[PDB]
Amino acid sequence: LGGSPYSPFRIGLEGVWTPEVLKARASVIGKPIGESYKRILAKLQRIHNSNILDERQGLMHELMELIDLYEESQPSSERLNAFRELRTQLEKALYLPEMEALKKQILQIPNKGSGAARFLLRTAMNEMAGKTSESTADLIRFALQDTVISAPFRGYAGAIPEAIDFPVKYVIEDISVFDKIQTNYWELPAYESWNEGSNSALLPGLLRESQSKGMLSKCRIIENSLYIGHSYEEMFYSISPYSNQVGGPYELYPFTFFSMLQEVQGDLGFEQAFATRNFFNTLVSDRLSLMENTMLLTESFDYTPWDAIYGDINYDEQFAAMSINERIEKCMNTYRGVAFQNSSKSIDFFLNNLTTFIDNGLTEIAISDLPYDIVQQEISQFLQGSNEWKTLDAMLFNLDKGDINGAFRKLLQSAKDNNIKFRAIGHSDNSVPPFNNPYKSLYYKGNIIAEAIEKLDREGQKFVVFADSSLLNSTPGTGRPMPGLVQYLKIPATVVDSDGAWQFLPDVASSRVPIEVTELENWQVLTPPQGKILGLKQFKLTAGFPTEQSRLPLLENSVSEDLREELMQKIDAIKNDVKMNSLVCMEAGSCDSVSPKVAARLKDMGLEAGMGASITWWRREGGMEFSHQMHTTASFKFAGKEFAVDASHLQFVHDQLDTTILILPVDDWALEIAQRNRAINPFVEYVSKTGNMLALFMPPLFTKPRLTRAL
Numbered sequence: 001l002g003g004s005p006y007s008p009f010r011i012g013l014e015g016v017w018t019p020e021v022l023k024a025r026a027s028v029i030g031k032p033i034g035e036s037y038k039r040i041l042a043k044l045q046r047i048h049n050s051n052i053l054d055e056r057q058g059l060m061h062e063l064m065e066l067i068d069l070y071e072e073s074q075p076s077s078e079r080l081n082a083f084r085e086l087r088t089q090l091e092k093a094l095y096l097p098e099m100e101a102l103k104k105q106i107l108q109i110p111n112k113g114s115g116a117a118r119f120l121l122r123t124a125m126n127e128m129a130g131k132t133s134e135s136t137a138d139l140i141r142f143a144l145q146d147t148v149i150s151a152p153f154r155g156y157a158g159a160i161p162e163a164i165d166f167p168v169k170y171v172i173e174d175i176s177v178f179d180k181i182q183t184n185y186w187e188l189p190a191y192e193s194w195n196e197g198s199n200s201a202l203l204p205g206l207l208r209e210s211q212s213k214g215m216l217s218k219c220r221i222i223e224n225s226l227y228i229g230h231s232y233e234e235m236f237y238s239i240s241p242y243s244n245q246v247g248g249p250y251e252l253y254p255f256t257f258f259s260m261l262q263e264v265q266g267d268l269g270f271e272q273a274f275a276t277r278n279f280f281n282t283l284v285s286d287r288l289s290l291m292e293n294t295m296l297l298t299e300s301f302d303y304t305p306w307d308a309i310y311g312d313i314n315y316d317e318q319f320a321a322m323s324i325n326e327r328i329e330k331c332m333n334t335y336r337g338v339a340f341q342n343s344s345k346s347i348d349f350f351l352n353n354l355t356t357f358i359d360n361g362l363t364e365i366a367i368s369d370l371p372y373d374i375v376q377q378e379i380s381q382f383l384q385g386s387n388e389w390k391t392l393d394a395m396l397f398n399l400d401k402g403d404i405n406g407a408f409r410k411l412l413q414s415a416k417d418n419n420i421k422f423r424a425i426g427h428s429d430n431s432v433p434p435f436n437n438p439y440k441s442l443y444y445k446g447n448i449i450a451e452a453i454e455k456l457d458r459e460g461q462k463f464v465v466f467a468d469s470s471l472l473n474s475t476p477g478t479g480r481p482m483p484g485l486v487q488y489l490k491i492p493a494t495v496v497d498s499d500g501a502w503q504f505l506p507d508v509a510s511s512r513v514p515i516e517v518t519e520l521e522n523w524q525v526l527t528p529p530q531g532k533i534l535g536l537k538q539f540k541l542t543a544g545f546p547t548e549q550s551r552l553p554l555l556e557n558s559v560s561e562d563l564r565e566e567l568m569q570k571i572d573a574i575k576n577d578v579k580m581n582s583l584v585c586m587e588a589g590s591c592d593s594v595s596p597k598v599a600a601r602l603k604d605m606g607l608e609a610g611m612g613a614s615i616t617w618w619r620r621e622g623g624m625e626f627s628h629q630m631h632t633t634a635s636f637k638f639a640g641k642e643f644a645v646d647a648s649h650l651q652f653v654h655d656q657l658d659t660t661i662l663i664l665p666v667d668d669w670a671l672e673i674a675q676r677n678r679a680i681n682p683f684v685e686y687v688s689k690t691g692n693m694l695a696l697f698m699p700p701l702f703t704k705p706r707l708t709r710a711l
């Protein structure tokens, strides 16, 4: 059942008005249907037509936003009673009564239709069902601090002219907004030959001159609107006094252009102010998906292997005890890599010893200070002797603080001259300071580490990486540490002294910690209690009744070929044990004391005791009630796995000639029992039960089947 009527998460629409019903409730005698109302009706129809539940809840959140916006724009509308009722219906259809704290956290995020709420509710439901790891609370914390996701949208929702030939990220709808700002960029000495009396008058010149030269190529004005194709972060790292001065290679013009964009922006977020709604939404959902990946990557990271090589208290002295050349040999030939801190001192040391790295097989240089998503192609251009790398060039000027000689430039130059691969592993999204928040820092670091894993720890590669210290070693993560590039890549991080000494950079204890948290308001744990919800559906037999024949593969696949014969011998022994057969029970309800007797005989047979297993589920009863039903088994332990020994399974429907004692690996046992019994929302705990602990063993209560129970 991929869409079960018994799932609490079925997103049922029984309590949500259809468009025809809305039409009568929201009708106003003299008022024709405006554009806002039409789009509300259209979206309501799409919701009711939606068969894919994830899309359905997505559309519902979008409708909530439409209503929010309408309420804000028309506070005296006589349609508001109907719209508010509809909004409450959608809230109740999505957020069940036991999800109050979740609902509050998620629906407090502005722009309910941005994708954030959809993603967060999807994650929450998967977490509650036991289909994803604990992540919702921390993904909410990320969303709440993120300068895009948490910002009430104030950008551009209009259409994009077909003349535009690049993907648009930002639009300034009315160019006159540039004349509203305090600074008169038109008075500045650099633009006196142009003869212009306003900021908006300078604008066409700045762009045209850019296009013909190199910079701001993805900016166009059409009919009083400015369309931008360069990302905020791309512009920030390629445009500054370092790269843009009077008489400089890129002159003042891009800086002037960007400076007034930022003045227009004011106290708003850049994307909040200027993004197209489309780019805004994409950014929201991409960031949440990437963060989730980063968080997942930190889960159960084992620091043991890394600490065994580099984590001894005296590793730094051992590193320092080697000559420089012995260190280079060890990094290249044994570790297959090394990282240096982001400093010009480190880069100069590397370049001064470059021959030695090359002689020991160096294949590649990687740096986090350039974004691959913007300049990887241009880097490839530089390396091949092309001149098409102006953005790269500007970015280098920024990195080198305008220094012509510049370490980053020199590093790149050396890769070309020496035919060594050069890789950017930075990722531009969310890369602009301030990094005054550990979630933004984690997001940014995670994307860089992900790229480095994909591109750097590969057979036949000997590499050096240059990165900011915050990327190198561990930093605070979500409920646990975020390991650094160096931990993930199995290499040491290093730094070069003011004395020019090359030394180890230890992973300090104070950084290898979780981010410090305050509980989210009234938060309830989402993850289920014990063992496992098998599925939020009714289970059924696929074929007919299981048989010993059908069960054989499950047994032989549970163990390696060399343990197979011994396993089958033990299974034969149990099935042919006189005392075990005496224990066989098949009258429903009278077998509750069987499992401890089975465990006792297994012990006397010399087998290893298992914890056992229990399964419980819901069953339809007369007058729309549901009862809990359960079963339990002892087990023996062999080759690391538990095997149910269930001498009372014949109390349940079965093949006519079935064996009296059911033996399967515990998971296969649970599945068989659930299917035979047409179990609804079955739940497994990996311990055998007797007496009260068995009789009242029931699935998590949120899984007891419910009506949609609205209007």
Ligand SMILES: OC[C@H]1O[C@H](O[C@H]2O[C@H](CO)[C@@H](O)[C@H](O)[C@H]2O)[C@H](O)[C@@H](O)[C@@H]1O
Pocket: 068, 103, 104, 105, 107, 108, 109
């Ligand atoms: O955009 C409309 C309002 O949306 C949010 O508030 C709603 O959702 C909260 C969480 O469920 C409720 O506490 C609140 O009563 C609802 O109005 C947002 O927090 C508000 O600032 C918006 O005005």
Ligand SMILES: OC[C@H]1O[C@H](O[C@H]2O[C@H](CO)[C@@H](O)[C@H](O)[C@H]2O)[C@H](O)[C@@H](O)[C@@H]1O
Pocket: 069, 153, 154, 155, 156, 157, 158, 277
């Ligand atoms: O630019 C200020 C306005 O920003 C918001 O409106 C934009 O975003 C909405 C949702 O994408 C669109 O429906 C609307 O067309 C856009 O202009 C904000 O909602 C407005 O109150 C502001 O005036």
